[PDB]
Symmetry: C5
Subunit: 365 residues, 5 copies
């Protein structure tokens, strides 16, 4: 992901205009393959119309240039690009709001399960490993950068995510469908077995534990649904055909005709169509937004990095559930043990923000 | 459903332009029946105006051609198409977010109910079959591909979804309304009977079980409401009349008049109206999006496949509640039993994504 | 409500164009009273300008016709109609998502309350009748077709919804406000009295029962709020004045002036303004959408039928809590008692939809 | 609030056009102070250009009239007015969805707390008074019509909302911030004290009681956040400057120039600019919608009446909690004690709505 | 934050027009750095074209001026500015709806934990300090005004937020990732230890306590996600390039050409382009809205003040859990002890709002 939040913290003169000189993640990196083709096609007609076509077949070219010029209209293209990109962006954000984070589950696992030895440590570690295997098994059929890292189910055994005893059991289900739901049942069975062992001392705690897994199930199912069902191909093709039809009329129609005929529109012969190049840039960088965000789990620059998340979620969870169970800092009296209104200090660099408390809009009347 | 997510993973040169050469699910498969009619109507006037109408009735045709040309405007049509398709798409996605998945219920059924013999197996199997019959009875009055598969309630008995003992009981209710709510009451009564049998050992578990059925009830009711209440016919007709009025003025008005009169707009006699055909394609593929997504439960290409779901939900649930109840893989020490920070390996093919952890935006100041 | 979902299941040639020949619920049924006025007003000027006004006062009419022609612009009208109808439709759907359905409460009432005789039957029946009276008392101050059916609170007694013992108690509150909240308190008091009688055997069940009534309270309050607070009259009037100002300039300004003066725009004298009639139809059918959906609880064609719902909810609930309490079909072994993978059959008519299970996007790489 | 729902129940000929003759809440009541200024400014130039400026300085005025006429465009103004009003309306509705209604709390207070004498009546009354004081203390810093009614915290004592014993305790906190959170802690402490007194007989009931106060806390905090943080002044100023710049060019540029020069656009000398007045009305009634709804808690006509709500919520709650605790109507057999399908009667006035139950879309195939 | 809600309470004549004379937070404070550059660039050509370029190179300038005039169109720019600002504003509000307020947790901490001495006071104070440390550790990596106030983790010790015993424990985790999740585990462990000490007397209360921390975890994670993932740089750059391309063609093309050639558009030589300056103001104040709200946690004027919140949340919580635990005002009979309908008085200043209760829309029929 491209991060530029610190560069746009304040609205100053050189804030947004300085983002036009960045290479990675910018339109200059995506439009390179198409600008060359457009320029070559444009200059392959200026070199035919001027030195190949004769005077007889040079007046039928001008009637085409003046006819393919009333069909360049900016209303419908700007409607479709703008009613499509909004939907693409809304889907893109919802695809991230459904990413499973095992932070609300490790808090309860580190507390409700009681034990600080063997058979109380292994239980917690397996209970927290199942919820991570569940997310790894789903972020492998939708993402590409994770598939190239775990090409086979035997590669999960070598990385520590799985076990040889679990691989042989997951191989023996006899179902042709995907198998990203088995760990969610293993977790429930292990938790019930733990409850019937004196570890969990109440049924309320067990129900609370199951309620936080029933939500990760939904979050993992929604990602699969989003990947399986995509935006209709009809809607995808309409925008592309509209944009290409618009830009095919600028090749013939926006060319600089011979001024010897004194046409109402053509009066100069500057070589470079600057305002055609700018229009191409502006109207293609709008389509490349959808082209980039139509599949957030890829290998682009503005795509989710779903390969450091599965390491952070492993390390943090394994630390929280194992090495931080009965470990708290010493309990001591605070600095404000006897003080009605604490007054934290302000540094010299930050003394403008010493504001007063808001007391209602109608206070000053 | 048409899936093309893997073809648009990255934003490259040949990514969106390569989707215009696909047959299934494209505008070329939907516009075939109307393009022929439009072309025939267009060419039936070029063949009358040129060789049937006389010179007297050839100058009243040109006043019609130049008069039916100021009524071709692209603003209101592009407003209605764009304020209608967005609503259609928003309804289409919500119709899928309400599909009942029995994955959050089988997890609790496989755990809370205790027994690994007869009278403890049949209980779980019937409890999980009722929730499937409930979804089958509703995905039969809204969908067509399921109705043609189960034309009669006697066909459900032969497929294993129902039983001869329950058919005779559902036939004896004496109510003229639909009967998609009976299994949701049978489930509750069976669960209460199971609780008063020593199977479920607490009331918290039973309440948790009922809470997950009270949600499937809402999800099944919302689909019926969506099917019963549709977008107003006034709104549906306005867009159609606008589009047809727009395209009826292109038959007479966009024709190539005789250049012998030197009209301000007509100066060439190219046979094929390429930029009229392109406009027809672009402005009809936008309407066909709504035409296709106005009823997601049909027999189109970009329509929900609600016939493999009812098989997957049966097999997965029946496997989960029967053959995986007290079945867990062996519990063993992990690969990182003594390791503060696990370091999973990276393959050679995926070594660019070894990124560093984000530590806040203001870290670098 | 007008239902046409089965007519638009598939996207075929004659799918949307066949909806323009329907009478009920169409623009032809709403625009009849105003098309006549528009036509009469239009033809009352063609009959004055041509045979009443003299040659002196026939050249000040044409300067008005050519001046009231640059004020016909389609952009602001299409903006307001399109930013208003979307809000109207969004409110219309939310008014239906708040309709109380007593299906999540009857499930718990038929199970938690224990008894299969007198004093255990009357309790359940009264508990389920209070929740129905609560919805009847609110769908009587917002809807008209229900008010005309129950004009007085004494009419509810004669229909079985109320009782003579409760009518005299609801008459004796001494509050000037509406009384649609009393049954929600009667239900709670009756449930607590039942709990302190050995009927409900736990407090978890009673809390679960009260949680499902605390939601119906919100759903009933939201409908009253929606009816009490409406879209601002300023916003309602702006659209009407814009549309009427647009259509008042088409009466004088779109008329066919005398071609003897050779004006730049008028060159023909066809009697019927076809493209003015079509514009009127298109731009008034858009306003009638908001005109119809601004109050869903009315007596139109595309309005909610809130008179069969209050019968279905009564019959279904009374059957569920009375004649289906301890009544379940016999428990027998399934057809798939010993079968790892069930294979339901496919009929001959539906054999194209035998699709294969989706196994992830990146499976084929 | 202005209520006109009953006048627009059905879509008839005289439905929306009859709303243009209403005084209160209409554009005619809001645009009066500005139409006079606009008319005076317009007619102060027609009276200078015609009888003050000489022939020399009457030909530099016409170049200004013809030059300040290509800057009157309706695209950007209609975009901003329409992308701003939608946000204003969305905020306006959310400001009402967060109004605290103490209807879900009194139901539980009237049931869970057990006692029908002194020390069981006072407890319930104080518990229900704290939740009302909490809402009164917040609907006094955001609203003006409530601040003018309770200008001082001593005025709450005289109205019965507060007590002299609570005023002295709320005066002795020593915090400069607002004090709208104290009753929410008093309620919790009183409920815990009641539980440790034999009144509430279980912890589940107490937790359910606290869960309904933790939601009113959020609802009261959201109103304060909405009042404290408003729409950015930049966004507010942009629309005003755009509208005023648009309307300043219509003073000089839409004037009726002397027709003695035969200009391409000016050919008549009608005194009143009817289509300029209509445009002013239409384009300023759109801005006044935002001007009115930018602060719903005011003293306008289309503003929330937050002064009858705080009386209804007091009377209803005090009646439900105190005088309706153990008070239920007699329990008797229903009219349909032995009847499988009840058949409520239909009156003669409402006999058209006897519709048949919907049985699915695909029923007729 | 800029607060002007009290100035726009009512819709009067001088309500919105009076907001154009405010300095702080206005467009005049943001456009100062760019207006000077634009004016200098504009006047550097009027001073070259008029007194530097010769008559030969003064006719190639006018063909550029007349050619750089058909590319000034307001449709696409007003589409992109308006489809971008809406998304920016929607993100800006959601960034505030996720701010953690410890008001729903202190209510339960002040009640469920039982004790009014030492070892019962320290427990509550530490339990409430952990939830504040959790929010301080996250509002330090996203905000700048808080980072400049706490540049180092040792500065938190000196302000009372942290302790020397917990600093040494947070220094000893051995993880390279951010450490904003440790207090949420410390809180859970301390609460479980308190429960196994006789302080919390039930498991329902402990589960309710943990449920309110599992929500603050999500609220704190969402802010970090919003800061880490920003709007795509492609979409950010497209708007800037469109606006700058629009405003670069107004420098040459909107200049006042020599009227000696009698051009169709240029006929006057007024020095100041008033309607170009106004367009610049209007089209740059729209971009500066996004420029300001693209990062709400900054040091602008319309930016969240996240430095008084962390003091209010500390003081209020510490007062609630320590000095207000078993402290309630005396319980006395109300003013309306025997009164069916209370009648609070109305002041003379507010007597217009004595409205009558709404009794349904169809009441008057
Ligand atoms: Ca991508
Ligand atoms: Ca379909
Ligand atoms: Ca209606
Ligand atoms: Ca107001
Ligand atoms: Ca900022
Ligand atoms: Cl799911
Ligand atoms: Cl160019
Ligand atoms: Cl429902
Ligand atoms: Cl053509
Ligand atoms: Cl409510
Ligand atoms: Cl016409
Ligand atoms: Cl809050
Ligand atoms: Cl005028
Ligand atoms: Cl999270
Ligand atoms: Cl200018």
């Amino acid at each position: 992901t491209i991060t530029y939040t610190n560069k746009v913290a304040n609205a100053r003169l050189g804030s947004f205009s300085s983002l036009l000189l960045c290479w990675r993640g910018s339109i200059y990196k995506l439009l390179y393959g198409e600008f060359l083709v457009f320029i070559f096609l444009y200059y392959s007609i200026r070199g035919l119309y001027r030195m190949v076509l004769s005077s007889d077949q040079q007046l039928l070219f001008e009637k085409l240039a003046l006819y393919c010029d009333s069909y360049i209209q900016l209303i419908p293209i700007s409607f479709v690009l703008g009613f499509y990109v909004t939907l693409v962006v809304s889907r893109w954000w919802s695809q991230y709001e459904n990413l499973p984070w095992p932070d609300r589950l490790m808090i309860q696992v580190s507390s409700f399960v009681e034990g600080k030895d063997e058979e109380g440590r292994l239980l917690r570690r397996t209970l927290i490993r199942y919820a991570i295997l569940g997310q790894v098994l789903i972020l492998r059929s939708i993402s590409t950068s994770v598939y190239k890292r775990f090409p086979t189910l035997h590669h999960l055994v070598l990385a520590g995510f799985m076990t040889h005893g679990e691989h042989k059991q997951l191989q023996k289900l006899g179902l042709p469908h995907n198998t990203f739901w088995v760990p969610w049942v293993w977790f429930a069975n292990l938790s019930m077995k733990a409850y019937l062992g004196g570890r969990i001392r109440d049924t309320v705690l067990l129900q609370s534990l199951m309620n936080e897994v029933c939500t990760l199930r939904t979050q993992c199912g929604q990602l699969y649904a989003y990947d399986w069902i995509s935006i209709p191909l009809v809607y995808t093709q309409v925008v592309t055909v509209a944009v290409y039809s618009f830009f095919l009329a600028c090749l013939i129609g926006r060319q600089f005709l011979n001024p010897n005929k004194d046409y109402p529109g053509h009066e100069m012969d500057l070589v470079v169509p600057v305002f055609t190049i700018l229009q191409f840039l502006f109207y293609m960088g709008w389509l490349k937004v959808a082209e980039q965000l139509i599949n957030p789990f890829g290998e682009d620059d503005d795509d989710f990095e779903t390969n450091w998340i599965i390491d952070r979620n492993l390390q943090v969870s394994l630390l929280s559930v194992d090495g931080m169970h009965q470990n708290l800092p010493p309990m001591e009296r605070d600095m404000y043990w006897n003080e009605a209104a604490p007054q934290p200090p302000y540094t010299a660099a930050s003394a403008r923000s010493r504001r007063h408390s808001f007391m209602g809009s109608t206070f000053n009347i």
